[PDB]
Target: Alpha-amino-epsilon-caprolactam racemase
Amino acid sequence: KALYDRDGAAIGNLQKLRFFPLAISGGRGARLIEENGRELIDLSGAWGAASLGYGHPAIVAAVSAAAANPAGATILSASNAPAVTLAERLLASFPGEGTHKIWFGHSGSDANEAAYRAIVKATGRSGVIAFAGAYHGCTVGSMAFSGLILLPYPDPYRPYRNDPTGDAILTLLTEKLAAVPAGSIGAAFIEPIQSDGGLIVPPDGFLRKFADICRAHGILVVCDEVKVGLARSGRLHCFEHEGFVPDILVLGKGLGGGLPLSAVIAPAEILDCASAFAMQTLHGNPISAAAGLAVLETIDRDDLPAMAERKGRLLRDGLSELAKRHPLIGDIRGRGLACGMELVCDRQSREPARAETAKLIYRAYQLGLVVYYVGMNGNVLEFTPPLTITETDIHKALDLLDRAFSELSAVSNEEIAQFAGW
Amino acid sequence: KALYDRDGAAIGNLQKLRFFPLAISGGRGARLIEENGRELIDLSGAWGAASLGYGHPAIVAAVSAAAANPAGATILSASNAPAVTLAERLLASFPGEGTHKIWFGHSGSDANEAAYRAIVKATGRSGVIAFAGAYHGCTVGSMAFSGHSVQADAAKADGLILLPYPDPYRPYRNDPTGDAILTLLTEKLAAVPAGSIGAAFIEPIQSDGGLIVPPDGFLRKFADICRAHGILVVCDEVKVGLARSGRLHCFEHEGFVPDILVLGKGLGGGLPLSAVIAPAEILDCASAFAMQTLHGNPISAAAGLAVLETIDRDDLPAMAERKGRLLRDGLSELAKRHPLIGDIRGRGLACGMELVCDRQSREPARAETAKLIYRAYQLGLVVYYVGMNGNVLEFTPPLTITETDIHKALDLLDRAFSELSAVSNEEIAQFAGW
Ligand SMILES: *Cc1c(COP(=O)(O)O)cnc(C)c1O
Ligand SMILES: *Cc1c(COP(=O)(O)O)cnc(C)c1O
Model:
């Protein structure tokens, strides 16, 4: 039986996000090795989780050593040195000396859930501001508000109310705040680059101004950097690009370099408001913790933010070259190695090319390239490879992507129909 | 400055369940190693997550090889070999009626939530039966049908029905047979529209409720009432599953097979991993529905496999049954000496010891229990308490715990009983506990 056929038989549809029959048995650096023998360049990096790539020496060393001599298995019922070392390391990376503490999780979902629960418990303020198209996780607790003030994301490519500046969204926020009692909203949840929305970098200056308004109202600013955080944006934290510092930082995916690990950096008052309150047995386990430590160590050691900045420009330069040749490309956006490329039927009408996008990723897979699409309209290719990816791998991936566009016709809508996707 | 103070400075209280200042920098077998190098026998096994203990060679080999050559990092947008192999291995070991599939998670919390969300999605029946005192998780979705104190302050599912647990030591309405509970169930089902309940969540030994083994034959009768009303039976074996009970699956003791099995804790051997074994119709009813990026990651999956292969190779069910008798015998020996010990219960290496002020009226001895484990810690033995009354000592050691470890543990436990008055009220007040 083929690996992909075994998968369909053993594993239920519930957790499947499948677009093509990718069936993996290995990985080395930025390359996935399929069962069938072929290597593929990973432009996805498991949605950004594989920050250091596959089999990075630092991850192997840290994880192997931890497995061999684990400081227990939890942070709930015992303090453990790896988790404490990682916590101090995270506090050191954030402007929160004496003011902030750490909460460890398994995922961005449980981390966002925990932040919200803790905010409500600590402040009694259960009202929330979030953006339409926001992704804060896929559990009841994180979809709770992923009471609610929904704002449009300030998208330069598709302005709200005919205002490219985004200032009409700040005016909307002002009205929504005045419409409801002061002290009713406890938190604003932001993505400093929108993920599921289609890798949208907000217009310049918007978020600084957004945060200002929140602070004026005693509203906590929660920055969700599960996707775009830890070196990936060309700086360590994505908010560094934006002229503000959040009250709360949520971290996940790439934090674990392949292991389940998330963290909330939050004021001490928020995280000390109760004990035994948001906890799961393997939270703060020393094997995930040691993996996270290796990720942060490598980020500093190998200057991964500068690597991401340098390699992102190269990638996005590459994409612009393809745009001269392929009219489908309408917008190329991003910071560092978090890039999006939106595909449109007309560049002036900006009408989304959904069908063509689906064929494009399927085709790219046949050619030896792993890339997925996101967006409200299913028309934005997401690029989040290992920060470790080689300049050679980028150029190869660019050729394959070029090839994919030239060969969309080679993919039928019935090959697309076999994979349920989103 | 020392590790425990550094922890208070860096890590919030929100996720802390602390009973004493245990500060760990290492582990070997059934032993935890503190910052200064002092060794402690771990009878908790991290609430049973450390199924194979610490630094077990099979976990080390599995994890190191998977880190070196990982099959991606996900089962969401890719199939990977470690996860499928693990899925089929779990499937092979389940004596299911019909055909079943696997959902993979990080924890028993996300697994219970996902099981429930899938049932509601597959069937449209949102009503749920769970037991008073039930612990199914600490996420919004899994707290919705839980009954423990941790979940006491959370939003409960509409159509949640809570039944008393069949506790031999504290029988509901003083009926030792458990008949009054099945009678209560019957009255509950008919105060509610026919076909409205989709699920019944069962702990085959109730964990946080006080490590409670139900009356013999009760769960089979309970399962029968559910099956006759179209209600799917969900067996939460996160705590008490995979060899720990003296059998591979704890339901093997109760003479019924569940529709859905939930796994976690010990499944990962120290890495985050859970699983749901559910009928195909339930797990296939939707796609991209209940998902987190690192679900089915190949490193957690490799450990899961090392756990099941070790369970098989070392016949860990048979080991647990014997080591468990050895442990409960030793505890019975302690009962003959210390009047606080009111009840000793459990299967295999899942054991509970309830402490009471008086053996006749069985009033819970809360203050002594806290002092007991604090003293045990000082003597070099790690053990926690559970229960609605905070009076139940829980023993869930690594399944690979040696006989000598157990004897050493029994001696330190004996000593901790003799010496609990050494522990001051002020010392305990420093730890928030439950
Ligand atoms: C992936 C992601 C999450 C959720 O993380 P999981 O690990 O999938 O639960 C939350 N927020 C953002 C911005 C993400 O990208
Ligand atoms: C521990 C436990 C859970 C929850 O598992 P986490 O790892 O804490 O999410 C659920 N049910 C039972 C019976 C448990 O023991």
